[PDB]
């Protein structure tokens, strides 16, 4: 019908408390947390490739 | 009369399961000898390959020629004469074609006029006969 709208809402004490106690995606809508730029399939390939390689050449791979 | 005691349930339960066997509807679905004799094996449809177009004669008080098709089934090699239903519907079929066959409707018995024919063609060449008869589609070669 279109007259009402229900939601939730939370009012913190400061910005550091609202930076610790808050989910990251609801801080990313305020420009305060920026997720990186990996796809999930890139990370599993890079993970399973250094499985095939011993000590310090694991940081070389990828 | 029937036995009517209070400790007679073993006489009652076991008389019935021997007397159940004289029921031909019971026996033909529980003995297993008529599902290894069924050409399908208890499927609603099956596919095959047309061997030839044999057309078979109607039964006694009414005369025509029912156009049938000799099918050889894929999944067990068995052979089957199936009836090509409407008019001009043999003219959508050539030899060595792949045909989905159904039952005729009497669950493994013949349907009146046609002698010994228990199946009917449904689809030819992966298109439907009702699509070809009514001109909705074209016969694929």
């Amino acid at each position: 019908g279109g007259g009402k709208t229900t939601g939730f809402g939370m009012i913190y004490d400061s910005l550091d408390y609202a930076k610790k106690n808050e989910p990251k995606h609801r801080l990313a809508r305020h420009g305060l947390y920026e997720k990186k730029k990996t796809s999930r399939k890139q990370r599993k390939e890079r993970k399973n490739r250094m499985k095939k390689v011993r000590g310090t050449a694991k940081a070389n791979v990828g | 009369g029937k036995c009517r005691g209070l400790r007679t349930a073993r006489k009652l339960r076991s008389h019935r399961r021997d007397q159940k066997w004289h029921d031909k509807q019971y026996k033909k679905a529980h003995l297993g000898t008529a599902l290894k004799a069924n050409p399908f094996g208890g499927a609603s449809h099956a596919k095959g390959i047309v061997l030839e177009k044999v057309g078979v004669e109607a039964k006694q008080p009414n005369s025509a020629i029912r156009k049938c098709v000799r099918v050889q089934l894929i999944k067990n090699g068995k052979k089957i004469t199936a009836f090509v239903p409407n008019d001009g519907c043999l003219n959508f079929i050539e030899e060595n074609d792949e045909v989905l066959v159904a039952g005729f409707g009497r669950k493994g018995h013949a349907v009146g006029d046609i002698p010994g024919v228990r199946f009917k063609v449904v689809k030819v060449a992966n298109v439907s006969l009702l699509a070809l008869y009514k001109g909705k589609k074209e016969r694929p070669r």
Binding site: - | K53, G55, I65, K67, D87, G88, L90, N91
Partner: protein, 56 residues
């Protein structure tokens, strides 16, 4: 028997084309139409001929 006549009458029939008429009606307005045909303003008329699609 001889398979040579197959689709004889299907191909022999004179091809008459279907005549264009209006779009019929659909749904609730169709049920209203056939209720208005049969129940309200039923005709005080030659009863016992209650055979709609009576030819003659």
């Amino acid at each position: 028997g001889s398979l040579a006549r197959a689709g004889k009458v299907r191909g022999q029939t004179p091809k008459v084309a279907k005549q264009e008429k209006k779009k019929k009606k659909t749904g609730r307005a169709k049920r209203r139409m056939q209720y208005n045909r049969r129940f309200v303003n039923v005709v005080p008329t030659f009863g016992k001929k209650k055979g709609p699609n009576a030819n003659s």
